[PDB]
Design a protein around this ligand. Sequence first.
Ligand SMILES: C=C(CC(=O)O)C(=O)O
Ligand SMILES: C=C(CC(=O)O)C(=O)O
Ligand SMILES: [Mg+2]
Ligand SMILES: [Mg+2]
Ligand SMILES: [Mg+2]
Ligand SMILES: [Mg+2]
Lengths: 417, 415, 415, 417
Amino acid sequence: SVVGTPKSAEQIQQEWDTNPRWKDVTRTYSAEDVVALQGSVVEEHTLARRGAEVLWEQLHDLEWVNALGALTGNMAVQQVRAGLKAIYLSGWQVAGDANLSGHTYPDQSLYPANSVPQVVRRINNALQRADQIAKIEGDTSVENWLAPIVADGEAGFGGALNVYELQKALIAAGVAGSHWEDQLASEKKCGHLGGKVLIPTQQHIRTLTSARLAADVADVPTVVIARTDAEAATLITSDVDERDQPFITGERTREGFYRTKNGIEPCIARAKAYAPFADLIWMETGTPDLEAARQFSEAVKAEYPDQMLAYNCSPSFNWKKHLDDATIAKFQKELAAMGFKFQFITLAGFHALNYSMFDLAYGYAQNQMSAYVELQEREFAAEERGYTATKHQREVGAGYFDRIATTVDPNSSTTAL
Amino acid sequence: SVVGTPKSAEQIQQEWDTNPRWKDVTRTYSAEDVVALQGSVVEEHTLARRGAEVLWEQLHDLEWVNALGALTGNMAVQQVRAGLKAIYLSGWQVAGDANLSGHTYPDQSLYPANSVPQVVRRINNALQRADQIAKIEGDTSVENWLAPIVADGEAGFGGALNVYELQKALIAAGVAGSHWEDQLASEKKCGGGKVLIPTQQHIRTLTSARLAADVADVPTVVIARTDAEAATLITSDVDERDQPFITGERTREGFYRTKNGIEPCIARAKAYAPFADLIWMETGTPDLEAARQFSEAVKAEYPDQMLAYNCSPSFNWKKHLDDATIAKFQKELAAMGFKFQFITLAGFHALNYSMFDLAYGYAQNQMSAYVELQEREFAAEERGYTATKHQREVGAGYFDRIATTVDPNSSTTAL
Amino acid sequence: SVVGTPKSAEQIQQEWDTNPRWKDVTRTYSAEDVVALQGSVVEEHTLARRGAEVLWEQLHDLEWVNALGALTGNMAVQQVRAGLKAIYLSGWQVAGDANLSGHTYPDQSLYPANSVPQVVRRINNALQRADQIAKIEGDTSVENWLAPIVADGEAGFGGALNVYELQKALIAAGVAGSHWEDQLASEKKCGGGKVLIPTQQHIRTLTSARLAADVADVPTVVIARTDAEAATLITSDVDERDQPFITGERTREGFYRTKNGIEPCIARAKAYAPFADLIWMETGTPDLEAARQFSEAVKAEYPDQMLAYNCSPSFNWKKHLDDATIAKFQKELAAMGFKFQFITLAGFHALNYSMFDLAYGYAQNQMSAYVELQEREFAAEERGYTATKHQREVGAGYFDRIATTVDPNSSTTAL
Amino acid sequence: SVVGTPKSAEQIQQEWDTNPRWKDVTRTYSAEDVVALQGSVVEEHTLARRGAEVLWEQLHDLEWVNALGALTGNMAVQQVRAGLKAIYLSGWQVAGDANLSGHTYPDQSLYPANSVPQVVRRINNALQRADQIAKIEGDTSVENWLAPIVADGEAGFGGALNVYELQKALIAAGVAGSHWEDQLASEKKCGHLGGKVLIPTQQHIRTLTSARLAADVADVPTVVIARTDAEAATLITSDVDERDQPFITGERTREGFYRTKNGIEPCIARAKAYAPFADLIWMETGTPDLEAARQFSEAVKAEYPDQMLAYNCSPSFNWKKHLDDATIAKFQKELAAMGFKFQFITLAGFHALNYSMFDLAYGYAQNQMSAYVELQEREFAAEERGYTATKHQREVGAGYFDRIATTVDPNSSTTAL
Ligand SMILES: C=C(CC(=O)O)C(=O)O
Ligand SMILES: C=C(CC(=O)O)C(=O)O
Ligand SMILES: [Mg+2]
Ligand SMILES: [Mg+2]
Ligand SMILES: [Mg+2]
Ligand SMILES: [Mg+2]
């Protein structure tokens, strides 16, 4: 058998040289380095490849791509049924309510490192079932059930090899893109002079290089997002990288961390340093602020006018205390005009799930079935916008499995499609 | 070490004889049979014991115990924060969106048999974190975070040993009660209907589940479910109790056609009563008259037998009922002896609907839709909702306190 | 994007019609039935396809394909390093020491149904790491590290849909072949014997497994196993092919007593042949005459039908056979058409014995026992053993090369 | 219900004050700090408590406790049947052939952090089945099937909270003791001036404190082992701790690591610093050397004469090239005389499994059944020393489950025990 024969270094190099996908993508390693790590057989990763291709297309065709955080398969199925074209997989949400430890965790890289890959695979499985059901029912209402997944890679749960293995695991599960941040969450100092701890610029370039190499060895054009936490971070592990030295204050704490001046300047500097190694750049920010977004946007594009940006819209910001309805209403459109082509709400699923269950359960504790009928009536109404989960058996594939059982029975006949 | 030394057959026997918990509980096996299966060390199962005890207490003190299906830890945390005293763990919901295969399945015992135990363990982990947070914050608003969990056991994923291992795994995870049904879902004929198993086989199932609870040394609550209302087929006519409803026709698989309805459900419920702490007649449409007839027929032989009731999540409740009937439904049922009531698919509907509504709003208006949800969350704070404070909701202050305890240059707040 | 576009019903049909792989393969369903179950995108399964292709090739080129049971990744790596061309994945061994419950189980389909797929995936991961290491080291001593895997499918853990999902999960993990048996282990009567299912039900199982392979678009090798040599009971007399052996007596569970032996195994094998790439008569004692009689009876109707043979790990081989018979056993069987042969429990015995012998030596003499094992490992290097270089065996040089690739101040060795 | 009611701070403090177990055990946190983290209900951890108690007993009664690395449940069952009184759970072996990623990994904290806890739970399950079988068969030949498990905790997969969560997960699975090392494996530099990277002394005291606190909050007297990697390590993350400064050379690498003088001196210094926080101390060493063992032994006991030590006997050292048979034969007895009360071979299971399968498979590839009969004959012979796995069905519990099935059947009767 010749199934899965690797490409040659020449073919790979030629694709890096000629495919517009790799315009302005720096790989400090060689095509031979990639082939040297592939063994004799390269597994195809169908969903990871299709998702990365679809995601790149969409980022260049649509006015922007927006997404909500999904932590279960059904959540993602509903996001797609409602008309979204991408799925965001929050590591925060996974820590909170969907990781392999079984525990509720805060957002400090506490959960087992293969947790997000498992949820990626779950989400793709759920979308695949929605697509199977759609096909056997002649449902053409959704063009692409297999929406690309953008997954939270945290800072990789360790060093370069941890980064590599996480990216490989995300790719195997069918991820379309992954984001990677330049902090050490496990040493977040929670005292009064504490805060987030950055790692040196060169180390995050190491992380982004590792992630790209895992994609190359897996032979898929995964979308790579660099996140910088330098807006708020007050500490950094080391001053060894001279690009970081302009912000070093000269103080070192009792734990050995270096105090560093934070804000938009180091975020601009780090984004420029990361741009050659990142398909998109993301400045984590506490306050939604169109002006600060524009300033970061323009500083980065002054050196890299084609560099695409990513934007998280803060779920904890008190939006309506601080912005009027019109600013809220135009926020994403403005950001998209500035180059933020991927935008998302990290904790959408957490809030929807916790709120809907609290509201239903509170009603239920006081009035039993009357609360449930309020929810059921809203579901019935929602049928008008395309909601289908009111037909619960069919939603989870009962018709699909009946068809399988009928296919297998030689005395029952299947309906022609 | 003496940790975990088993009891004697004598102590076990005396507890079966004198503890009011075991009035009306038949064990066809012996206390020696139990001790023989325990080895040299018996692991303590704190959460399974405490949950089963609280569940029994509540079933005898409150007017009724009700619950909503939970498929995530946060879901159960919110149900308890909102004032519920029990959690229902739907295997249907687990098939749909929370099982170890990673796949979306319909309700036919397709998922790996240890999936529900994992979700039990997750739910307990989440309630324990809520309890930890409440303690360090002086929050007394909820008196018992560790609400008892009642879990779906399907028909055990096989034979008596499969039942035994599932009950053992549910107990290990900290389950308080488990329900067990008398159908073979993996042979549901689809041309058809559900296929029952003989009455004696389900008595075997209930005996297996009680034996696993005994060997684990916890007073787990056992719920027997009968699917005889709707089931049209049965695997065999070997049981004389099943023969009155056998028509005599056999399908191409060898299954026997059987008259379904409330009559075989009353018969099977009476057969199951000695082996079940609660009895549940699965029904498709909510029907107070059918519930009353089943209740009364069963209590005519076992006036103390407690019953359980699923309130249909798919029934178009209102299309068919006025607001007052809907509002009194559970109270009427409770008066009939239905002391555990639940909505199996509450979580599935809350999750799917809330995400569809948010996502549709978002696709059309971006941040304005999220702001609608956020404002509703703010409003809900007035009723005790706390998840707007998201970091604290998932334990950020708790883990900060651990970090402060471990740091010798920081001092911990005294409680 | 066009990635993963399904084939047409027409292409599938033509491949079933013209590819020699599907000579003598009956599909009672249609190509349209297959396309209807594929959705819009078909995931490629590289390892399942390559393994199934290599396995079919080898079964037609070599005198016979033999294998040992592997329950860990390293076990399979050593089997291939030693020169074997296939891996056997024992579900018995998985029950005993490698299943997702964490428990030690006997051989009664007690473990979670996705456990064997996980071990398939693990074994492939381990072979892939060995292949990676060999490449960066210029090691050509092994031509194919990715030996095809044949996995135990039990009886599917339920009905047709359970079979379907198990085959799908085995393919997803990269399995090359899977075997499926016609008993209900979860009802093994223990007073007793194995309980068969009707012939038509196992044809349903094999059809389910072929359908799952088709929908996944891989030419998985399907092995049908019959337990009719020893089984004394059967669930139903509904199948006319089973009736000649029914005695007419029924047990208290409703099972029918049936004459066991080679005769019902020949009958069932002939019934299964159109739906099976290989046929396997489970047998307790190795018996060349019984193997010859079964082989010849089956090939009288299907002269091209390939057979599979488990060589008993519990038989006291030698107490009963001279050295020359033992030495020729597999070659004789191969001459009879047994083209896949294996020892189910090779790994269980190698693991348990090597650890008992080492640990006993250690308990009595501490380091001297370990030094005995280490010296034997050194000696084995002469035959190609490499695990004495332990860091390199588990990938230390490979991950060093990744670290060197990622570091822009270090240069990588050219291959 | 009152099941699982927590103890008061007073009871806890009184046990720390009066129980000889806690003689010379420093806790820098308070009993109130412990109670503050326990919520309203404390789960009992039966096997973790019994294993920690049995392990402490054995460490004080026997001349020493020795162990072999086990990576499957059957391996541990065989170690106990052969007469060992403890089980060692190698994280190396778990990386190599038994972790939740499914992948073969080298020993660099690459696998998901809950992997060892899963194997602990597996090993206890396997021993529990052996004990059940023994009881129903009247097998009294083994006194304690539930041998204590000592598990590899690596350096905790991150910071203090990662350490805490791993220790809690090990305790929940029934671990008896856990060991913790002072290196950052994920930044091991593999170049020519590379090597292992130490963390500051104060940080490892933080790790050991965290591990003790997780045990206290879980209410079990888990055995805590500190390992130092300073014999060979050439780098350290920071020079901020003045106890480390004597060995700092003054050079810092391009990655920001500090070059540090290695050997037995920093191992003695670190062991002394760790002793108040560790039930046993372990100097990782490359060469088995009774003299170096004695020197480390005596330096530590000069300040802490009662401090127990732990010793790994190197599986890669070429024992018979470098030591005569008599030294090999007396090695553990000598070490025990010097205070090494827990001794183990980390990779015993890896070598036994890989070698036995290679030997069998090589024989099999050339001669089919003749190779298997050689193995079977050795098993038959081994029956004489108590080996039972030749009876394969009974070994994995077939008799136990037949008894369960017979217990459940009201028309079959059980055998009286
Ligand atoms: C809440 C989050 C989650 C995260 O850190 O990924 C944010 O606002 O970015
Ligand atoms: C091989 C090992 C494994 C380990 O690092 O724990 C050693 O010798 O210590
Ligand atoms: Mg995160
Ligand atoms: Mg169900
Ligand atoms: Mg088997
Ligand atoms: Mg290790």
